[PDB]
Design a protein around this ligand. Sequence first.
Ligand SMILES: *[C@@H]1O[C@H](CO)[C@@H](O[C@@H]2O[C@H](CO)[C@@H](O[C@@H]3O[C@H](CO[C@H]4O[C@H](CO)[C@@H](O)[C@H](O)[C@@H]4O)[C@@H](O)[C@H](O)[C@@H]3O)[C@H](O)[C@H]2NC(C)=O)[C@H](O)[C@H]1NC(C)=O
Ligand SMILES: CC(=O)N[C@@H]1[C@@H](O)[C@H](O[C@@H]2O[C@H](CO[C@]3(C(=O)O)C[C@H](O)[C@@H](NC(C)=O)[C@H]([C@H](O)[C@H](O)CO)O3)[C@H](O)[C@H](O)[C@H]2O)[C@@H](CO)O[C@H]1O
Ligand SMILES: *[C@@H]1O[C@H](CO)[C@@H](O[C@@H]2O[C@H](CO)[C@@H](O)[C@H](O)[C@H]2NC(C)=O)[C@H](O)[C@H]1NC(C)=O
Ligand SMILES: CC(=O)N[C@H]1[C@H]([C@H](O)[C@H](O)CO)O[C@@](O)(C(=O)O)C[C@@H]1O
Ligand SMILES: *[C@@H]1O[C@H](CO)[C@@H](O)[C@H](O)[C@H]1NC(C)=O
Ligand SMILES: *[C@@H]1O[C@H](CO)[C@@H](O)[C@H](O)[C@H]1NC(C)=O
Ligand SMILES: *[C@@H]1O[C@H](CO)[C@@H](O)[C@H](O)[C@H]1NC(C)=O
Lengths: 171, 169, 171, 318, 318, 318
Amino acid sequence: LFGAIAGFLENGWEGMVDGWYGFRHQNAQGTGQAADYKSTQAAIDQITGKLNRLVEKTNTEFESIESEFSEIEHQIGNVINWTKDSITDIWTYQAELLVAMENQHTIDMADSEMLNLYERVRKQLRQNAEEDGKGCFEIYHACDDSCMESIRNNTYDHSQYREEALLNRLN
Amino acid sequence: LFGAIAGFLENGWEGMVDGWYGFRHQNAQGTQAADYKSTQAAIDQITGKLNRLVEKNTEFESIESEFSEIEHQIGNVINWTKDSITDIWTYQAELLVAMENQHTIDMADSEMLNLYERVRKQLRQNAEEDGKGCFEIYHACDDSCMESIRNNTYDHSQYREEALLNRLN
Amino acid sequence: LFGAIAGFLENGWEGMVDGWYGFRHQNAQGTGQAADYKSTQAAIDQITGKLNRLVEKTNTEFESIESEFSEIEHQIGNVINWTKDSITDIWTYQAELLVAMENQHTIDMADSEMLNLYERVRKQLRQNAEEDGKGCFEIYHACDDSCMESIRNNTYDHSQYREEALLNRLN
Amino acid sequence: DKICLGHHAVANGTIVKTLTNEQEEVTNATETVESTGINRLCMKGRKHKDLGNCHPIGMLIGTPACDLHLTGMWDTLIERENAIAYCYPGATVNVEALRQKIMESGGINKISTGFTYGSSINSAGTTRACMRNGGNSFYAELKWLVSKSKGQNFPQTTNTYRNTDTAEHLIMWGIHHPSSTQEKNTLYGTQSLSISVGSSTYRNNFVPVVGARPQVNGLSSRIDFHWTLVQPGDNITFSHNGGLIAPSRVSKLIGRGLGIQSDAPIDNNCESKCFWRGGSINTRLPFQNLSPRTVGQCPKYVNRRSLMLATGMRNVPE
Amino acid sequence: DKICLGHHAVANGTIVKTLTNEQEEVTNATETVESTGINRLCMKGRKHKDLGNCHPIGMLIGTPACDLHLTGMWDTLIERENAIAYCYPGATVNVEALRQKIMESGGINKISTGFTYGSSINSAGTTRACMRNGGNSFYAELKWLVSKSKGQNFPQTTNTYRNTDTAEHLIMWGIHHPSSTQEKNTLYGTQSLSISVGSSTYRNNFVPVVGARPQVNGLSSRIDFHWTLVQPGDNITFSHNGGLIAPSRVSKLIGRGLGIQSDAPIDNNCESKCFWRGGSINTRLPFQNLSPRTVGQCPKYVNRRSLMLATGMRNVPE
Amino acid sequence: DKICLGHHAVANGTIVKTLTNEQEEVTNATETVESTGINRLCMKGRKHKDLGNCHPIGMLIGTPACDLHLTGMWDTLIERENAIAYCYPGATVNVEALRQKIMESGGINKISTGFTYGSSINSAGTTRACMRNGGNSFYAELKWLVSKSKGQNFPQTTNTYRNTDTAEHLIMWGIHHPSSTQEKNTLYGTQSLSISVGSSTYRNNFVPVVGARPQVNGLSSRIDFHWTLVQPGDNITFSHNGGLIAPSRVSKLIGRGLGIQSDAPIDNNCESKCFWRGGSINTRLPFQNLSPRTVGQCPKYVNRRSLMLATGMRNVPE
Ligand SMILES: *[C@@H]1O[C@H](CO)[C@@H](O[C@@H]2O[C@H](CO)[C@@H](O[C@@H]3O[C@H](CO[C@H]4O[C@H](CO)[C@@H](O)[C@H](O)[C@@H]4O)[C@@H](O)[C@H](O)[C@@H]3O)[C@H](O)[C@H]2NC(C)=O)[C@H](O)[C@H]1NC(C)=O
Ligand SMILES: CC(=O)N[C@@H]1[C@@H](O)[C@H](O[C@@H]2O[C@H](CO[C@]3(C(=O)O)C[C@H](O)[C@@H](NC(C)=O)[C@H]([C@H](O)[C@H](O)CO)O3)[C@H](O)[C@H](O)[C@H]2O)[C@@H](CO)O[C@H]1O
Ligand SMILES: *[C@@H]1O[C@H](CO)[C@@H](O[C@@H]2O[C@H](CO)[C@@H](O)[C@H](O)[C@H]2NC(C)=O)[C@H](O)[C@H]1NC(C)=O
Ligand SMILES: CC(=O)N[C@H]1[C@H]([C@H](O)[C@H](O)CO)O[C@@](O)(C(=O)O)C[C@@H]1O
Ligand SMILES: *[C@@H]1O[C@H](CO)[C@@H](O)[C@H](O)[C@H]1NC(C)=O
Ligand SMILES: *[C@@H]1O[C@H](CO)[C@@H](O)[C@H](O)[C@H]1NC(C)=O
Ligand SMILES: *[C@@H]1O[C@H](CO)[C@@H](O)[C@H](O)[C@H]1NC(C)=O
């Protein structure tokens, strides 16, 4: 667990329907919402990679060893019965583990990309902002829609506003 | 591996029999507590693994006779099958606890780091990390204040300006 | 995934051969590259354990139930085929799941070991440095080559340069 | 001025199991176990034989139900419920082993033994248990031999079939077991009867035995069927003086095919690789719960109704 | 002013295996491989039959060891080592499959054949080898047919069992193989013997063969048992000459049950679902290393003494 | 002033497989599926026995090709592809189970029966099919009994072998099936032929099946072999009319060793524990793709050319 999804983020945005991960902002102009392509594709690329492994078919032909319409000798039938049940017990265990092991890693991977998106933004904002604990960053300079976009564009230049932010933080 | 256990935190606390994860005081007049939610968060995952482990059973009957001889060739087929079925269940079972113990360990780790980060984000600018698990709080924190830190009700705004110029001098 | 490798770090260093993980430094004196022993060995030892588990297998003795040079009876030979092919399908499955699962874990752990070095350095540097988000720490005091190795050895004292560094961060 | 971070959620989120939690709620999930199949036998792309009425055994000895299936080529062979092997009541030694072999074949070809009998033998016994076109008849590949003059001792006769081919042949014969002393005497005489068969790989003796039995297909008598493979270049000889149901053609099984026992109707438009009693299975999933008995290239049968694989993150609603 | 975060730890940790490290100290752990079973057969809640020194086959045939196991209803059947099947020396053809049937069953009911024999047949013969109340006796369910006047030709006899029920019945009979030519001549006559047995789905011939054999139970003679299932509404007919150990009751196997081969003592207080040659196994764990050879609902046998599952964090002490 | 953290990478890197990614690139990796095996049988530290043309069955009956293999001790047995079991036409009933027991054994010992025949019997007959040193010879461990005076009835004979050892002995014998009635009459007389074998646990009768007159055909002269195991303290009695091919010695299979069927030349300098028809497998890897059919302590066979395991981090090149 990386502490983000169902961790310090209180809940999910049902409103966000264009991505797995996103931004919501607030400034004077108003409030917005956008979705982050990179990180969602990272997560969905890793899911669809799992599903291909799932669907790798392995073509081993099998014939019939127990008749459906005729009598089979009692002793060989109990041997076939024991073997076949034993293989099914194996494959039932193998499937149930597979799904449980995969799901655990699917959840936590989805968690990590959220925390990787969050971390990138924190490092970008630098000393011009502070974390509020609920996954938000409080910014100490005016940031208009074209600036908020530069945070999502990954092109936000922290040194531009560094003078104004630092003065607001310290008073 | 999340860094906290066998990582930046030096060692375990034996005096803490109260819970898995905990806090320790340093202030004038005072000095231990365990965190409830973060230990349940870990115990509830251990007993999750345990409940899976004890799941069940297919009924099997006898296919080699214990008190009589049975034909040589069918006997060799039956020895081979069971032996192969055991090589499998033995492999499956040394894999199960191995990758289970890896997850269990690395998960307890995880829950410790999440307590750490939760508090870090809460002290905010009023404190800094010593890198050994501790936060040096650049202001005065009586026993009530340290309660509130363990409470997730600490208000950083209360002390920010007094704390800030303290960090700068 | 912990976000350091193939993450916020943009690429690995071919130039470094002394280790898995290392530092590059710039100061008045010049460039340097040195590997970290503690960390490239915490991660290497973990790999070796994986190898021991892999080859530390002691095997059951199996005799021959299928005759190479003479015709075996038809019904029982068919039962033997079905069982061999079934046991083989399972081991093929197991072997592909082991490798994929171990590979995912190996890569993520390496990522973990890297980030862990970063964190120890970031905490150590404390309020005398800042992060650029591509893996470096810009240092707000002049760091001597002797001071640089204090960072690698965990010798750096932060209190020593605190007054001096806070001043250059703030101006 | 602040920017926030977060993730999507949905109103109805599917539940999946995890290693530590069996009630985990996730945004999306998909099935790994196939629970539906085709109630047809998808035989497109396959040269196939639907035998219907014909039991695979019936093919070698020529039961009338099998007249359409005496010789063939196929890559798939289909046996149907309640197929007929025996017109005249009987049983075959190592019956399952032979049936399995035919089901593994990719065809049958028939070769005449070439047997000829003197004037004392009547080669053409028939019965109403083996009807063929409103007419009494007999297994098409075997000949029932009886004395021409009733009650007179069947003559001592020697018959040899030589396999002059490059591959083994499957020869079959029967031993007739009468239902009464009267009938045995009428058919073969009062003499003591012996039938001995042998090749380089086979030696045996058979003796018809008279005992009363329940009527099956109206007959109290029986025929036991026997068989052996006759290698290329080898000969098999029958020495007999009453009671041999002798082969008039031998068989040759050819190549390899997949045998299928099924209740399903054929569909030549769909194509598939996995089959069972109920029909065919076309799927991508590694596991299934339709049948514990499948055939072909099939997913692995698991003992679970459903196993769901997470396609999304944890679902935390708004 | 500081505040410090920490994790617990314990004085002595338990070691566990992980993917990268044998020897990983952990605060707690719990064994996942059961290693101790119970040295008793825990039969609580089961309506069970302990055969003791009675062998399964002997229930059918009526060996004196089984005189208290000739019928019944059970859900668990226990067979003991060295159990007795034959008082008169001999063997059963196809014994292991017969024994498995019986051992898969839930009961036995006995149905009389009703066979009766005319005056030239003495059907009450007994032997030294089958003792009841200290004197000569025979299998309770078979009868030894001999000529009443020693030396004379045992008469051509017919006997028909008719399954008037709606389940199948099991029928056993013995063939007698004398020790010398005088014996055979005295018991059955100088004539050549034959025993034919036929139903709708069964036929066989048998011939008593005279031979010298090591004395077992004081007898160089041998009774060799045979058996077949008789379907509802079908009949089975014995045409015999001399040499038939004739059935006077048939059996009807009924329902299902778990068959346990063990010498452990019964104990009606503990309860179990899993059993081996040593006593029961009761455990919650999924793996056990007591026996690779169990019956019923058992944990899976793994070839290891221990597999410890971590139940707490890494142990890091001062 | 800066200080950076970083990781190594390599100009050339391997590609591995992951849960989420098929094409992942890592700094270093190793093979987990062995694909090379040694083409010789590595016997270092194994007392072995290389049969060559001797077939294991021939060891028991003393076929001339096995004269240097009538006895010995081994912990490994090697059988070769075209090995000779029989000098004279015929075969063994239940041959595979028999072959398997010899292959499971740790050596063979021979023990004389002590059989001894009256003046009426000629016990020294040989044949142009079994040649020893350019002379007519017979299977070493048996003896073809015929009437001393030709055409006179073979005397009624009894032979008993008494196992006075502490282990089980394996005893083999043959039945001779003559080419014609004239040959059978000459050898054994005109009497009806019977051969009875019996222990405390074994009972069987054999009658020779005489052939028909042309020499080339399937019904010619042959000798087929039958076997069984005799327990300690037990005697097996042969009561016979002629047509028995009597044992002169019986075998005692001893201890346990591993049987290898293989084409491969011995290499007495390298060591190994896993074998297959092609050679040996020496590896630390847990999987192999060389052979589905292995004997001994082997890695599991997997249907994959290559499974690479990661031994370093992701490779991100500059
Ligand atoms: C299994 O054994 C059964 C017992 O033998 C066989 O059943 C018998 O088959 C014969 C011939 O097919 C039948 O015989 C005839 O009976 C009628 C008169 O039938 C009516 O009167 C009798 C006497 O009171 C009564 O029992 C019947 O139910 C009828 O009401 C005569 O006209 C004929 O000449 C001839 O004698 C038997 O009736 C029949 N028995 C039964 C109980 O059905 C059966 O065939 C055997 N099964 C097999 C597979 O062969
Ligand atoms: C014909 C006959 O047996 N009469 C006398 C012989 O019994 C007796 O020899 C002794 O025979 C003993 C075996 O006897 C039984 C037996 O218990 O096994 C006696 C049974 O009544 C008889 N039953 C039937 C149906 O025949 C039974 C049977 O014949 C045999 O089992 C077939 O082998 O034999 C025992 O073997 C003694 O060792 C033996 O001396 C001889 C000599 O006293 O005199 C006969 O009058
Ligand atoms: C099958 O029967 C044929 C005819 O009896 C056997 O054929 C011949 O072998 C003899 C001896 O080698 C030759 O003189 C003949 O010229 C062969 N016949 C022909 C036309 O090839 C043959 O040997 C038998 N097969 C076996 C296995 O014995
Ligand atoms: C070869 C021969 O004899 N054919 C006759 C048979 C047999 O004699 C019996 O089936 C043997 O018992 O009996 C019939 O009644 C029949 O079956 O229809 C008439 C037929 O002409
Ligand atoms: C084998 O098992 C199937 C179902 O378990 C059953 O219907 C059949 O009776 C069993 N066969 C034998 C030989 O016991
Ligand atoms: C979840 O997966 C199913 C199958 O891929 C798909 O139908 C669905 O659109 C996905 N659900 C979403 C997009 O939430
Ligand atoms: C074997 O023969 C010996 C000598 O006659 C005899 O002592 C012994 O009782 C016989 N064995 C059996 C079991 O009959």
